[PDB]
Design a protein around this ligand. Sequence first.
Ligand code: VO4
Ligand code: NI
Ligand SMILES: [Zn+2]
Ligand SMILES: [Zn+2]
Length: 413
Amino acid sequence: MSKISVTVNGRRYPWPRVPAIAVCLDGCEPAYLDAAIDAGLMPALKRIKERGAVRLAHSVIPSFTNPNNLSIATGSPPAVHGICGNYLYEPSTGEEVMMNDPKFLRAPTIFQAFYDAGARVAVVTAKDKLRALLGKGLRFDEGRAVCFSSEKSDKATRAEHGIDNASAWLGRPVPEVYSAALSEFVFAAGVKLLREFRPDIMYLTTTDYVQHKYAPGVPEANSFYEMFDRYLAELDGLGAAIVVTADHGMKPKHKADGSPDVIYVQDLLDEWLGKDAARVILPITDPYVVHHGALGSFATAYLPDGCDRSEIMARLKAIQGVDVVLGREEACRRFELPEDRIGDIVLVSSENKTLGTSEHRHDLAALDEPLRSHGGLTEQEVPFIVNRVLPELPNAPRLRNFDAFFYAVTAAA
Ligand code: VO4
Ligand code: NI
Ligand SMILES: [Zn+2]
Ligand SMILES: [Zn+2]
């Protein structure tokens, strides 16, 4: 007998004999897990690590939520699926269109590929805009797919989500968006789906609310992972093959005084090239939000015609805090990004600095806690833990977070 498989974006996925689950712990710097385990708060993960396969994997660069979640969902980098930020910039017209609608996804998900082959597939996200992206190509008329978010769980319908009101179904209220509970709801939904729906393939993804606010090992961070461990214990106990990984890590990005340490890339380009001659894009989050939430460690810039790119790149690279400056061609090759959705230059900042646009209008420092963020090479390294024996499993840099499903189904097969 030849074995059954599903081929997705040039990778062959064996059919899982038991449910195959990937859990994306948003912003989970490996240190978070080390600290919670050391505090005796994660007995299940502690045992799973001991008896399973423990690795570190490399995220996609930019180490942001959407590019990484979509890489995990498709088993491919942004050069294939097309989601390399939160919004793209039109060189002419000067228009900014969003990178949140599914029509911008250019490759099928593993979920669709398995669904189309007859599998039972489940996707639970914390935020609803990711739900729509991740759910592309799923159908809800055969009782074989479930896809909803914690955020809009009470709005779920059979015809569009595969379930009528996930809040009522789970027996928990819709959580606050800015809360640990938004992620807890995902884990609880995942367990109930495993019990009652028995998916062949399931993805659970969360938010990095807690991680942006609290460093590894502080009480509020520890309590989050303590909470997660309970659900991990239940999933593991139910017999699923599980990969626990993250979309990206998290580092402190604040000066000694606790204020954001920022390099304002637009200001610098204004002086050298003329005001608004170039356009700096910060892919971390939506461009019409200004409350310190738009600070990450990766930026791209669209330069005016007939300017010296090589000269502009050399000046930025000389700045302390700017670790990597590359042209579109080199950046797309190196980070595996699509050329048609990236600027003329790509900038990556140092470990404890971020990249902003300009100081005129600035970015409003609203929340108190010292800045923590991601996007750079220093948030690329993520945990990759499997609850099965897998001695051949590679390690970083060969192992990617978007190998999660490949190894989940392999472990399940
Ligand atoms: O939604 V994010 O983990 O790129 O802040
Ligand atoms: Ni909850
Ligand atoms: Zn994230
Ligand atoms: Zn984040």
